[PDB]
Ligand binder design. Structure first.
Ligand SMILES: CC(C)CC(=O)C(=O)O
Ligand SMILES: [Mg+2]
Ligand SMILES: [Mg+2]
Lengths: 377, 382
């Protein structure tokens, strides 16, 4: 049932991804509902995006047939990889970047209620020259709001990246390490409070231009980050802690950045203990425009010659109790996490611990050897 | 030339990358002579994964004495007229770094945090903090039960900080310094962001590890650092550390053998020298024995059952300097100016020397993974 995780209009869409048909990772385009092996046009997705800039026609690759006819299976139904065809993460050589704390109104309010409320929002809004829900990060209004927050003793390093001029942008994981649709993702076995983060992921080419978008799960360990923000990397970057997919949807007549900007991202978590968590949260509340976030990651002071993928952040808060009252959500082995939006489909993974997930073994040199052996270089 | 190589470099085994005119080439320097080992393995990462530690690497193609090669630093060859160019000695490795592994750095991190990145507040905060702490941080082993009891004391003192958690708690601070293939090497320009007004070099020793997590050798490093970004918010760590040309490793990795081992890394005296167009001079020394966690312990936290690195990784071990010498205004401390020359040196590894400019004036990073792949393929090396 490969159709259940594609966008409802996928046959009218342009998808860009990676599939192993049995010889190794192959960049594919899906157009008219049919898969095209484009490896002879460009041997990687990063190379394809660099070879064909926006507005250029991408030629046809070799026909692999209707995507729904490929026997693709997820790990929880095919634990041993018996399937003849394996869908992969749609990234290969791109750097994996991630923004965080991009929904500021959420952050601000959560601090005002931790203190309580209606009375605190008066002064902050009057000093800002405006309602908090209109906060513009990096503005002069945000600057006066910062100084008012400092004067109240409510300021924090998190509000700095919420409303200051610089967004929080970090490296989510090493190149070639992402999980894809239908893979296991890993939380550290020594983390006790962790959660998914349902996100939209931008595809950017080697010229810093936004080409398309996919779904992402930024697997997150709250107990590490909460002990120290200097453990951010350890909270975000472990074996199988990144999932992107199922495909990147490229911008065309049917789909553009404006569709990303108004995308409703849904999250569902299902456990064997019969725990269920559901929730939806709209990209229109993001406090920094996706094109602005791309322009902070890429510019005169940082380039990315193979391109980069960019997680745009989330406003989902893992506060729903599971077993321990007041301590919020945490994963258990075998949880199924679905991240979905209508124009991009469904990214679904199974949760295990980083030591039980398959280790990351296929790195840059493994790809090079594989592509060399197939005559694709 | 010999000015930037180990004292005993002709007796050492050095591993690095040189562009002779056709693209990046993994080289070994033995007996003072350069070997092109590209036909043995096409990258440094591949070479470390093909030969385990202790295994003798067979001889490559002789390229003559190293001192006979016309290698020139950017401050003497701005347009790159030299026929040969020395590169960073990493290629496919992930660039990993440890933080606050020396007490002098830990204190300056708490200072810039409480200053919220404002250099004009550092003197006042340093005067308070340096006396109340100091003699405290190195009084415990990080991650021990003792360290947990010191944490409870400092919390009661009102002195606790998220930086002390990674300085003495069970988890070291490890982060990604920059993207694969983005490092600068000896003789390159490094970059501080043009919008940073409180910044510094960070001399460090850099380990080379293979794809099995084994420590293989060591180089020198400059982890160019923006204090005003990181002090404003620790969530800006990546932006404080990872910008165009903000990473320098070199001149070569020295591989472990009978002339050099991890024990030499553990006792290495490291020297920092900064010189500017304004005739500012800083010169200082510190020793690796002051590190709070053994280098093998740090590599063991970076690599294990919960994070692999199939192409290997480089690991900055943490800076042992935090420059606070006043440059222009009494009490205002240090920051870089364009044209600064930064020398990191220790006798067993040589000299890593770079010229500082702003990230936007440094040449952009254009040679990434695809460029390397295409270059190697065109040379028949795959
Ligand atoms: C938090 C980091 C700035 C600390 C660091 O890089 C170091 O101490 O070497
Ligand atoms: Mg995020
Ligand atoms: Mg450092």
């Amino acid at each position: 049932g490969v159709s259940e995780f594609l966008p409802e209009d996928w046959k009218a869409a342009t998808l860009l991804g990676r599939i192993d048909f049995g010889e190794g990772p192959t960049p594919v385009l899906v157009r008219g509902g049919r898969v095209e092996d484009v490896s002879k046009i460009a041997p990687t997705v990063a190379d394809l995006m660099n070879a064909f800039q926006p507005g250029a026609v991408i030629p046809r690759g070799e026909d692999k047939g209707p995507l729904e006819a490929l026997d693709i299976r997820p790990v929880w139904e095919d634990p041993d990889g018996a399937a003849p065809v394996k869908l992969l993460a749609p990234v290969d050589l791109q750097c994996l970047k991630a923004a965080g704390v991009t929904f500021a109104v959420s952050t601000l309010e959560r601090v005002i209620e931790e203190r309580a409320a209606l009375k605190i929002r008066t002064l902050l809004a009057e000093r800002m020259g405006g309602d908090l829900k209109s906060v513009e990060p990096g503005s002069q209004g945000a600057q006066r709001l910062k100084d008012a927050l400092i004067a109240d003793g409510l300021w924090s390093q998190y509000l700095e990246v919420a409303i200051g001029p610089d967004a929080e942008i970090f490296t989510k994981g090493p190149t070639l390490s992402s999980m894809g649709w239908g893979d296991q993702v890993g939380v550290r076995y020594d983390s006790h409070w962790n959660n998914p983060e349902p996100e939209v992921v931008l595809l950017c080419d080697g010229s810093g231009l936004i080409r398309g978008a996919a779904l992402g799960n930024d697997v997150n360990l709250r107990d590490f980050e909460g002990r120290s923000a200097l453990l951010l990397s350890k909270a975000k970057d472990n074996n199988a802690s990144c999932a992107i997919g199922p495909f990147f949807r490229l911008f065309d007549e049917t789909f553009g950045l404006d569709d990303v900007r108004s995308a409703e991202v849904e999250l569902k978590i299902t456990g064997r203990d019969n725990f269920v968590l559901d929730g939806k949260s709209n990209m229109s509340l993001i406090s920094r425009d996706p094109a602005v976030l791309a322009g902070q990651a890429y510019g005169k002071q940082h380039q990315y010659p193979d391109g980069f993928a960019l997680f745009l952040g989330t406003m989902f808060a893992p506060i729903q109790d599971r077993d321990t009252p007041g301590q919020g959500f945490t994963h258990k082995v075998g949880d199924r996490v679905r991240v979905s939006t209508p124009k991009l489909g469904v990214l679904e993974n199974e949760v295990t611990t980083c030591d039980k997930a398959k280790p990351w073994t296929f790195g840059i040199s493994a790809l090079i050897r594989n592509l060399a052996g197939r005559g694709l270089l």
